[PDB]
């Protein structure tokens, strides 16, 4: 009854994927400030997709944040620790933040994944 409607409430979370694609569309044309919006709205409805915080972290990198990029990357890795891009981006953000050891090990983590 309510449980099936709950699985339906799940499967309807493709909103996240479309917000993802749209935000990506904004990113590819240099419009990051709306990419982040689509990414946020995408996160609000699931939730457990690493692509959203990863890409949002990349946009954050493109607008000189690093802190926000680092937090989003950490979350993305928490969701999927097999996504090398999150590690690379977090390594970049940390490199800009002055966290050189951690950035280094994130980088050789990228090297370790890809390979």
């Amino acid at each position: 009854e309510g449980e099936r409607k709950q699985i339906e409430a799940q499967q309807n979370k493709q909103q996240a994927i479309s917000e993802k694609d749209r935000g990506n569309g904004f990113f590819k044309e240099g419009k990051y400030e709306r990419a982040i919006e689509c990414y946020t709205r995408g996160i609000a409805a699931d939730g457990a997709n690493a692509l959203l915080p990863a890409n949002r972290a990349m946009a954050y990198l493109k607008i000189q944040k690093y802190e926000e990029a680092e937090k989003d990357c950490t979350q993305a890795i928490l969701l999927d620790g097999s996504y090398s891009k999150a590690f690379a981006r977090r390594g970049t953000a940390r490199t800009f933040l002055g966290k050189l050891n951690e950035a280094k090990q994130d980088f050789e983590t990228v090297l370790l994944l890809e390979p």
Partner: peptide
């Protein structure tokens, strides 16, 4: 630059 690519 490949990390720059968005999936």
């Amino acid at each position: 630059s490949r990390m720059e690519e968005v999936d």
